[PDB]
Amino acid sequence: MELLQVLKRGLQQVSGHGGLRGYLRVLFRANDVRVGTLVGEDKYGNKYYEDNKQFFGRHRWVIYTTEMNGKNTFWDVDGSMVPPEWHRWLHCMTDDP
Amino acid sequence: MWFEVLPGIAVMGVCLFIPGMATARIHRFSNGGKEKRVAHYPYQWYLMERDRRVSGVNRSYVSKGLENID
Amino acid sequence: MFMINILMLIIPILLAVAFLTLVERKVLGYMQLRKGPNVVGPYGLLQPIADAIKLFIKEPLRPATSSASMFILAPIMALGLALTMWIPLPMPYPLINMNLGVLFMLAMSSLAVYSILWSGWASNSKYALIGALRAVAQTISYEVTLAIILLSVLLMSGSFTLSTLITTQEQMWLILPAWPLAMMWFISTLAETNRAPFDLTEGESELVSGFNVEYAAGPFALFFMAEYANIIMMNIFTAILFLGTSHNPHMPELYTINFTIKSLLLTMSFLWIRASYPRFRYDQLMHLLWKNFLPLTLALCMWHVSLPILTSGIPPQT
Amino acid sequence: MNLMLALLTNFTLATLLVIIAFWLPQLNVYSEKTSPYECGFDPMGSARLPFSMKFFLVAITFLLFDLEIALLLPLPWASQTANLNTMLTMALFLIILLAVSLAYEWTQKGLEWTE
Amino acid sequence: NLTLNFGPGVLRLVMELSGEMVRKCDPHIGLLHRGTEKLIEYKTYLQALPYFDRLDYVSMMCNEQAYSLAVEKLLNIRPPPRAQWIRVLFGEITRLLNHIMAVTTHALDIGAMTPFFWMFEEREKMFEFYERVSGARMHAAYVRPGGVHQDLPLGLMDDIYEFSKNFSLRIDELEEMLTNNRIWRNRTVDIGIVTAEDALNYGFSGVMLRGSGIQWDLRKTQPYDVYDQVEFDVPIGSRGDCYDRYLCRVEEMRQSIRIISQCLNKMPPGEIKVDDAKVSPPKRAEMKTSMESLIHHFKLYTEGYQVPPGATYTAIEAPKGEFGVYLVSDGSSRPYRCKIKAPGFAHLAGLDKMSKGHMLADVVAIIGTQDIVFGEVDR
Amino acid sequence: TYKYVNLREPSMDMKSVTDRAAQTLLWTELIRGLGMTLSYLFREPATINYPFEKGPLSPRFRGEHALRRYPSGEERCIACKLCEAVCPAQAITIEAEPRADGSRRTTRYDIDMTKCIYCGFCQEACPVDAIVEGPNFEFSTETHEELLYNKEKLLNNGDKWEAEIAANIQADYLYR
Amino acid sequence: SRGEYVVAKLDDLINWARRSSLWPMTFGLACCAVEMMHMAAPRYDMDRFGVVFRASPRQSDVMIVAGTLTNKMAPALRKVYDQMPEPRYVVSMGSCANGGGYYHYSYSVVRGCDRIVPVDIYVPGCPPTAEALLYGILQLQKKIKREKRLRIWYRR
Ligand code: SF4
Ligand code: SF4
Ligand code: SF4
């Protein structure tokens, strides 16, 4: 029965991203298909999530925007795209977004 | 997680299944839907050649039954 | 139609080798509390393709003072023989149905030692010649046991035909009456294919270099391809020999599915072992063969020559 | 013929993968490259590897053990004879002599790697 | 015979081989010689502190402690008790960092590659304790003559307790892979035997002494800081070989959890650097309101405190063995001479003797069992 | 106090001897080491998803340098050169002169980021919290010349990381 | 066709392979090498980006100079660099290999490995965090992705 529950989380992740297209978009951009709570969004398009069921280190992540200052960042993401005010939250230097 | 290793195994498993399936299917295609004849000893080869002379056509996998004896 | 059959053997073999590298890198990682390739393609399914293209558009550096003819011969012989050992395998129907299939496998396997010797001879390094003479000495030593263990099993099967091992094991696997041989056979295949803990030349990196450490680019990829094809081939041999599958002439696909599953579980046991044990010293793996395995294999060869006679269980010649 | 086709294809393909390996890429060679790897240092002598006697003994021992195996290969066929008492005696005689041969190299320090 | 050249820290072994055996082993060092002992003569005492994080770069805070004890001895001052308990706490978290590196790299050299990865997720968590007290994962520069730089942040001892409560199981998994493994015992038992009298005469220290049965540990014979207010046992070997020393290092990692368990419960309150503003800088909030505290902050960070003239050899039980500094002073703000006694320098000098009558594959096992880092051998 | 790691004598009763013979011939301890690597296969891996996840840091982290300002926009640095005197790697160069308004400010302020040992002594010595090490650790470059910062480069870092730098100082200045 | 289109797509393919299968050859020289090991440890797992843990000079594509380069060691480093098959990139890790670092003024230290070999990425720090080195490697992959080897050949 618990095994049957596993295959239901793996299905509701496809819906958690808005369907099959969104599921594939985040699979080919971030290599990860988890779904977490949305903490906020920044002026450049970055979206930040969290999931406290995950172990320390994987409990916060950012899905980078596809455009930033005129650069097509659909594939070319980079850790320096995180703005400072969110840079403190992502690196777990504070608990307050 | 550990099940993210299966997709690599599934691809590798299929690649090892194809050679055995293709050989099985190609043998039946070329021998009228039957197994290929195994002739490891001369007596088996003498019967295969005789089958080739009995079918009329030069195919040792064409079998003539009681209909051919009158 | 036969020429189509060859291409349905060679091409799927290489694809299996290319994706055995991914499976090895991910099974190793998860036993090490990490993931492995998951970026290049979904779950790293494109990682094998990236490596192959990378190696074949690199500079194929051949040393100036190297014997060019032998430098090229070694990788050709290694890969050529690797694919030749797949033609008689009954999966369940061989491409070439040999009456002496088992004996043909031994002969081609013993020829592969030349690729190791030519590679170390043609490089003019003497850092790679010592590794070659060490690898050559390890491979010839551990094929004495393979020839005797294989002979002992054929005394319950009755012939050299590989398709007959499917009939010997039509009621029961041979691993039950021959697990002493299976244990020594399994470790012998590790020592033949230079796998850990018997990998003193491929990647020892203990004040010792490999025999093909002078190769680069495409020529290196050919040594690697042959090495991994033989790994898969040796575990297919172990499945047919000791874990035989049942053959239904009307559903040959059932044999292939079950036969493939056992071959994968045996190939994943080469990755499992590499992650668990340290590597032997050179003298210690020589003492393992000459002082432990060979004395027991000779005793068990005497035992398996007289057991059929003393129980009235001699198999049929044909 | 089916066997000669299989061998020709196996070695023909392996040769194509070598020509495309030595011709497709873009080469650039000079003196420092195309030298023996060593370990980042210069060679310490213009002499080849000294001959080692112990490596020669393993090779010769394997050859003589290999030849004794050649006589053991037809045992599967030999168990079908009517002279089983004769056949079984010579089978064990050969394997025992192969053991006596090993028992000699062992007790004369032929299987040792310490100088 | 076959004179080969092995190597490319980085070592250059020039070994003479007669077959598999090793005839003479000649270590050529200096591939990582940087002139540290001459650069310290141009620095003040505070400016020379980061140089000691880079000698044995697996045991950073133990090297710092030895230098502070020497300067504190020539300064004739005493760090406060809370500083001392912090230094024992982080002196033993550092012993765990070194033994994991020393045991799993030793195993990595001889083919065992999996334990390296298990215990480097334990080093990674300990690096977060370094980062949370000093801001740097490796080269903290946190222990200074007079005490420590800053106090522990609130909520750090909880995470050291949570970590140390699971670390005994991690060792047990490591011992499952190695201790009873026949392949691992054949590589270590009766390899690199050293007699007690040879160990003493060759200048060995640490496990190289205790693997041979000598009962000597500076934490118990010449205690420093508060090592006489904590209880631990000293592992002792019997064979004197690589296997016994390997066990000695796995048992020390167990005795450090014992010591850490006590440093957490017995941590006292108070200041974390000596209340003497001519040696340790004042608090920043009094540097900005007191006239004297601005004068001393100015002088301590430009000229530095003056050490009275004298010379001292001060040694501690570093994870790799006795680590000491012979520090000469002429009365000024800069040391006149700083000889660094690196334990690996004496051990690597005994490689040739320990390798007598062994194969070439045992020389790798011998170098690992001495736990050689060429930051300190070459300085 | 001491303890013996390896001072044991195996028992020589036929029960124990047979146990060791079974171990030698049946590879029991080897097959017990396979179990430990099988269990790790079924544990969740410890890998984070970089660059979409970042390893935890702390307010005290020593990263890239930055010159700060007062809330009014005036520069905090008053060319005292304490940071230049204590830098153990001699990676700071400073020149100064009276400004047009008569204030004490710098004309040259260089940090050679390939000499710097990223030690923190410059932010300890500074009496006005002008030079700090922000939390940035992702500033690698394709040329050596790009890692030789001058005053213009350092003030841009301060004007770029002040939202985060000010917060980190707030969370740690009571420990200093 | 236009010819340019085919060359543009072939450039993408070969660039993709080269940046997706980087095999480094670590010259672990000093403390910076411990952080390089922590980039292979479970938390970061550079093997997942296609970066194998270790290789030999003949099968390596990128050299990571991580540590102080002494005068006694410089000739050894150059000979290993010359024997790497091309394309070959160099990553300089840490202050010691960048410009000499703490030992810049020493009599026995080479002031930056760039005096001996051409460098592609300079990773700052003493030592750089295992995340900084990972950021440096990913920056090198983008640099390979921008290469235009075949376009420039077509316009020769
Ligand atoms: S961090 Fe240390 S080395 Fe770097 S500039 Fe500041 S004082 Fe100098
Ligand atoms: S210590 Fe501060 S105020 Fe003085 S020169 Fe340096 S940055 Fe400016
Ligand atoms: S840059 Fe720093 S950490 Fe790296 S080798 Fe030099 S001193 Fe050590």
PDB file of N, CA and C in Angstrom, chain C residues 309 314, chain D residues 78-90:
ATOM      1  N   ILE C 309      31.018 -41.642 -13.070  1.00  0.00           N
ATOM      2  CA  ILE C 309      31.254 -43.075 -13.202  1.00  0.00           C
ATOM      3  C   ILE C 309      30.758 -43.818 -11.967  1.00  0.00           C
ATOM      4  N   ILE C 314      26.891 -40.613 -16.364  1.00  0.00           N
ATOM      5  CA  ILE C 314      27.644 -40.032 -17.481  1.00  0.00           C
ATOM      6  C   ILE C 314      26.660 -39.460 -18.497  1.00  0.00           C
TER       7      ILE C 314
ATOM      8  N   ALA D  78      36.074 -39.080 -23.580  1.00  0.00           N
ATOM      9  CA  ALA D  78      36.692 -40.329 -23.158  1.00  0.00           C
ATOM     10  C   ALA D  78      35.852 -41.112 -22.162  1.00  0.00           C
ATOM     11  N   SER D  79      34.837 -40.497 -21.563  1.00  0.00           N
ATOM     12  CA  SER D  79      33.988 -41.181 -20.598  1.00  0.00           C
ATOM     13  C   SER D  79      32.912 -42.027 -21.259  1.00  0.00           C
ATOM     14  N   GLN D  80      32.851 -42.042 -22.587  1.00  0.00           N
ATOM     15  CA  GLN D  80      31.877 -42.831 -23.321  1.00  0.00           C
ATOM     16  C   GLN D  80      32.428 -44.182 -23.752  1.00  0.00           C
ATOM     17  N   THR D  81      33.672 -44.493 -23.404  1.00  0.00           N
ATOM     18  CA  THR D  81      34.285 -45.747 -23.804  1.00  0.00           C
ATOM     19  C   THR D  81      33.786 -46.895 -22.930  1.00  0.00           C
ATOM     20  N   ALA D  82      34.008 -48.117 -23.414  1.00  0.00           N
ATOM     21  CA  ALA D  82      33.707 -49.306 -22.628  1.00  0.00           C
ATOM     22  C   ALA D  82      34.821 -49.659 -21.650  1.00  0.00           C
ATOM     23  N   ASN D  83      36.009 -49.084 -21.818  1.00  0.00           N
ATOM     24  CA  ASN D  83      37.140 -49.350 -20.930  1.00  0.00           C
ATOM     25  C   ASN D  83      37.234 -48.246 -19.878  1.00  0.00           C
ATOM     26  N   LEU D  84      36.248 -48.237 -18.981  1.00  0.00           N
ATOM     27  CA  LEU D  84      36.174 -47.173 -17.986  1.00  0.00           C
ATOM     28  C   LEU D  84      37.225 -47.334 -16.895  1.00  0.00           C
ATOM     29  N   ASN D  85      37.525 -48.569 -16.490  1.00  0.00           N
ATOM     30  CA  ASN D  85      38.567 -48.770 -15.490  1.00  0.00           C
ATOM     31  C   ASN D  85      39.922 -48.321 -16.019  1.00  0.00           C
ATOM     32  N   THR D  86      40.216 -48.628 -17.281  1.00  0.00           N
ATOM     33  CA  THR D  86      41.447 -48.142 -17.895  1.00  0.00           C
ATOM     34  C   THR D  86      41.409 -46.630 -18.072  1.00  0.00           C
ATOM     35  N   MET D  87      40.311 -46.108 -18.621  1.00  0.00           N
ATOM     36  CA  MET D  87      40.219 -44.677 -18.886  1.00  0.00           C
ATOM     37  C   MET D  87      40.325 -43.868 -17.602  1.00  0.00           C
ATOM     38  N   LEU D  88      39.639 -44.303 -16.546  1.00  0.00           N
ATOM     39  CA  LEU D  88      39.638 -43.537 -15.307  1.00  0.00           C
ATOM     40  C   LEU D  88      41.016 -43.516 -14.662  1.00  0.00           C
ATOM     41  N   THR D  89      41.781 -44.600 -14.794  1.00  0.00           N
ATOM     42  CA  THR D  89      43.116 -44.637 -14.208  1.00  0.00           C
ATOM     43  C   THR D  89      44.051 -43.643 -14.885  1.00  0.00           C
ATOM     44  N   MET D  90      43.978 -43.523 -16.211  1.00  0.00           N
ATOM     45  CA  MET D  90      44.867 -42.600 -16.908  1.00  0.00           C
ATOM     46  C   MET D  90      44.434 -41.151 -16.740  1.00  0.00           C
TER      47      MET D  90
END
